Design a protein around this motif. Structure first.
Motif, PDB file in Angstrom:
ATOM      1  N   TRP A  40     -66.570 -30.656 146.398  1.00  5.67           N
ATOM      2  CA  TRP A  40     -67.565 -31.296 147.245  1.00  5.67           C
ATOM      3  C   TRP A  40     -67.386 -32.466 147.912  1.00  5.67           C
ATOM      4  CZ3 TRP A  40     -70.537 -34.572 144.579  1.00  5.67           C
ATOM      5  CH2 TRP A  40     -70.561 -35.137 143.066  1.00  5.67           C
ATOM      6  N   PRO A  41     -66.881 -33.994 147.230  1.00  2.32           N
ATOM      7  CA  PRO A  41     -66.697 -34.988 147.634  1.00  2.32           C
ATOM      8  C   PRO A  41     -66.026 -35.595 148.260  1.00  2.32           C
ATOM      9  CG  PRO A  41     -67.034 -34.766 144.585  1.00  2.32           C
ATOM     10  CD  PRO A  41     -66.558 -33.587 145.971  1.00  2.32           C
ATOM     11  N   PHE A  42     -65.266 -34.489 148.888  1.00  2.00           N
ATOM     12  CA  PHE A  42     -64.026 -35.062 149.976  1.00  2.00           C
ATOM     13  C   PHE A  42     -64.476 -34.545 150.900  1.00  2.00           C
ATOM     14  CE2 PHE A  42     -62.892 -35.750 145.807  1.00  2.00           C
ATOM     15  CZ  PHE A  42     -62.063 -36.992 145.841  1.00  2.00           C
ATOM     16  N   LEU A  53     -73.319 -46.924 148.419  1.00  2.00           N
ATOM     17  CA  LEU A  53     -71.698 -47.574 148.249  1.00  2.00           C
ATOM     18  C   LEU A  53     -71.742 -49.014 149.058  1.00  2.00           C
ATOM     19  CD1 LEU A  53     -69.757 -44.237 146.827  1.00  2.00           C
ATOM     20  CD2 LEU A  53     -70.528 -45.904 145.945  1.00  2.00           C
ATOM     21  N   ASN A  99     -62.209 -46.235 144.270  1.00  2.00           N
ATOM     22  CA  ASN A  99     -62.681 -45.769 142.514  1.00  2.00           C
ATOM     23  C   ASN A  99     -61.908 -46.779 142.033  1.00  2.00           C
ATOM     24  OD1 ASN A  99     -65.026 -44.721 143.713  1.00  2.00           O
ATOM     25  ND2 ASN A  99     -63.241 -43.260 145.000  1.00  2.00           N
ATOM     26  N   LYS A 100     -61.993 -46.865 140.615  1.00  2.00           N
ATOM     27  CA  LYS A 100     -61.420 -47.153 139.331  1.00  2.00           C
ATOM     28  C   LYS A 100     -60.761 -46.306 138.710  1.00  2.00           C
ATOM     29  CE  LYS A 100     -65.475 -48.256 136.980  1.00  2.00           C
ATOM     30  NZ  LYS A 100     -66.105 -47.442 138.067  1.00  2.00           N
ATOM     31  N   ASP A 103     -62.050 -42.460 136.700  1.00  2.00           N
ATOM     32  CA  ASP A 103     -63.366 -42.711 136.769  1.00  2.00           C
ATOM     33  C   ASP A 103     -63.397 -40.706 137.428  1.00  2.00           C
ATOM     34  OD1 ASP A 103     -64.324 -44.583 137.382  1.00  2.00           O
ATOM     35  OD2 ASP A 103     -64.119 -45.039 139.224  1.00  2.00           O
ATOM     36  N   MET A 108     -60.939 -35.992 139.723  1.00  2.00           N
ATOM     37  CA  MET A 108     -60.556 -35.125 140.837  1.00  2.00           C
ATOM     38  C   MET A 108     -59.996 -34.838 143.102  1.00  2.00           C
ATOM     39  SD  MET A 108     -65.121 -34.973 141.172  1.00  2.00           S
ATOM     40  CE  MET A 108     -65.863 -33.887 142.277  1.00  2.00           C
TER      41      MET A 108
END
Ligand code: QCZ
Length: 127
Positions: A40-42, A53, A99-100, A103, A108
Motif C-alpha cells: 500500500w505505501p508503494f 514529509l 528512510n532510516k 524503519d 516493507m
C-alpha cells in the motif's frame, strides 16, 4: 506544502513495444508485489503533503511508485523490460535513500524487493 507532478505514464513521442518480457512484468511481477500486505505505501506517488514529509522531494529527485509502473505497463509506455526493471529498482532505492534502516517502510520495501528478485530471476527469454 506542494507535491511535484507525477512521473509521466503517457508520451506519444516515446517509441513503445508489447514484448513477452513486458507482459511477464505486468502479469507476474507487478501482480505479485501489488497484492502483498506491504504494497500500500508503494501503490501511488509519495504524498509529501498528507504524510508531512516536506523534505521528501528535496532528497528524492527521481520519484517512482508501483501506481506509475502499473499505468506504464497497462498503457504500453516501455520499449524494453530493462526500463521497467529500472523503475522498480528506483522505487526501492528511493525508499532506502530517504528512510532510516529498520524503519517499517524499509522492512516493507525489503519484503517486496525479495519477491521482485525471485520473479525477475525467471524473466523469460525474448520471443
Ligand atoms: C515510499 N514511502 C515512504 O518513503 C514513506 C516514508 C514515511 C516517513 O515518515 N519517512 C520518514 C523519514 C522517516 C512514511 N510513510 C508512510 C508509512 C507507510 C508504511 C509504514 C510506515 C510509514 C511512507 O510511506
Amino acid at each position: 506544502s506542494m507535491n511535484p507532478p507525477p512521473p509521466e505514464t503517457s508520451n506519444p513521442n516515446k517509441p513503445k513495444r508489447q514484448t513477452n518480457q513486458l507482459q511477464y512484468l505486468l502479469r507476474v511481477v507487478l501482480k505479485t508485489l501489488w497484492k502483498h500486505q506491504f504494497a500500500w505505501p508503494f501503490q501511488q506517488p509519495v504524498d509529501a503533503v498528507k504524510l508531512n514529509l516536506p523534505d521528501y522531494y528535496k532528497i528524492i529527485k527521481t520519484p517512482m511508485d508501483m501506481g506509475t509502473i502499473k499505468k506504464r505497463l497497462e498503457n504500453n509506455y516501455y520499449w524494453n523490460a530493462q526500463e521497467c526493471i529500472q523503475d522498480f529498482n528506483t522505487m526501492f532505492t528511493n525508499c532506502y535513500i530517504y528512510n532510516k534502516p529498520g524503519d517499517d517502510i524499509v522492512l516493507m520495501a525489503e519484503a517486496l524487493e525479495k519477491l521482485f528478485l525471485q520473479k525477475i530471476n525467471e524473466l523469460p527469454t525474448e520471443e
